[PDB]
Design a protein around this ligand. Structure first.
Ligand SMILES: [Cl-]
Ligand SMILES: [Cl-]
Ligand SMILES: [Cl-]
Lengths: 255, 251
């Protein structure tokens, strides 16, 4: 369950660097921790013993990833360059941006691209009018139902009964049966509109990003407010634009 | 150093080896670029794969999107980066040009926050987490101006001073005199020394101690704003935002 339990699950593998896993887990311990963190606080978050956590922080400090006053610790901007290593080496992310920017300019709305990681979607590219590297739940987002629809029937049920299908609004689908029917309908449309299931006033439309082999690599969407655009404009104007841009992107990376 | 975790340093350096390599990498390439022995690289990659940070097909390796969340841990736990976004956004919304915030990382500046305005640097596509040389960017001249004279001269005697354009200052003497004027000015304009058509003005961000933490800038196209307007109009807005961000963070 905990980050430590994940690390110690490989303790029988001789090629698994426990201290590198712990160090990466220490970086993750700062997620959404607006203030700075002590050793004890990080050791409670991750269940990593304080001695290891201190040595991880000490190591990150000497490498320029972190700083301290002796009591609290905070990450340094150099950590951002780690995410850049993924961006500047991933052609999908690089080639999506001009499409994301043009979509945003035509419609005056935010446009995004996410992949699936576990039970969440991970925003890998944005074009704003909440952040690259940020996560949202898959079951109640447009881009997530796209990527849940790409799953085979086996992996989808394993997700549904294992995910926290918490109800966020009056309209959020929160049970596996309702969601599976929803996914079956996304599967048949090849697009997805979610209306105010993540938070009120928010309504978005997503389409899949394919490779030349047919696999869904990712999803593309547009984020709108319910008061400005209607479901009619979403499906009759936004959808053809998103599909045109998605096929252009597919053809550009993979012929 | 007994508290230094070598495999953690190597793993992070393995990640960094993928910068600007849009092609899957071998053990051999990563070892050559980082000087890390091949066996240690192998184990580092194996650990990254098991943790979901990287993937392989048996021969080559590439990073997975989960690496992006590492940077998100910095952005969502640092007041400097959280509080600067509203300032950057209202600046770009007032002047209709891009606004940015950067710090000094080694010899480069590091972009840690951007406004929503699209500014397509043709020479290098710029994202959050990307770097630019300090000697020829507005924000870089600010953060170099914060160096003492000794550290500055050490930088100038080793840095790569490529003449990006015909206007780029690319010799240590000119940069030195240019930095010294940035010191006394409190701001810096770079006119098309990084790329043609690009011109920016930058100011420093201080802490309560008076130390330069970062720089704010406005990135403009030369066909949208005259040099007078960068300094008559864009400049005072940058100081006000900087001093407000400083007060909001340190009082
Ligand atoms: Cl090692
Ligand atoms: Cl030129
Ligand atoms: Cl001019």
């Amino acid at each position: 369950a905990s980050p430590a339990k994940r690390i110690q699950a490989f303790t029988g593998d001789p090629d698994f660097m426990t201290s590198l896993a712990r160090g990466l887990a220490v970086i993750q311990a700062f997620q959404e921790r607006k203030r700075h963190l002590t050793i004890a606080q990080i050791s409670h978050r991750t269940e990593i013993p304080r001695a290891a956590v201190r040595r991880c922080l000490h190591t990150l400090i000497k490498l320029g990833y972190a700083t301290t006053d002796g009591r609290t610790y905070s990450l340094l901007p150099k950590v951002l360059t780690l995410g850049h290593a993924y961006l500047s080496s991933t052609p999908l992310a690089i080639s999506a941006q001009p499409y994301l920017d043009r979509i945003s300019d035509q419609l005056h709305e935010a446009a995004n691209m996410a992949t699936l990681e576990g039970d969440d979607i991970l925003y890998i590219a944005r074009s704003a009018t909440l952040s690259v590297g940020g996560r949202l739940p898959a079951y109640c987002t447009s881009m997530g139902r796209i990527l849940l629809a790409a799953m085979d029937d086996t992996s989808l049920r394993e997700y549904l009964e294992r995910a926290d299908l918490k109800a966020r609004t009056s309209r959020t689908l929160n049970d596996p049966e309702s969601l599976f029917a929803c996914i079956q309908q996304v599967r048949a449309q090849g697009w997805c509109v979610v209306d105010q299931e993540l938070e009120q006033g928010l309504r978005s439309i997503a389409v899949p990003v394919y490779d030349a082999s047919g696999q869904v690599l990712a999803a593309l969407n547009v984020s709108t407010h319910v008061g400005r655009v209607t479901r009619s404009e979403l499906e009759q104007r936004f959808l053809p634009i998103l599909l045109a841009a998605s096929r252009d992107l597919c053809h550009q990376l993979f012929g």
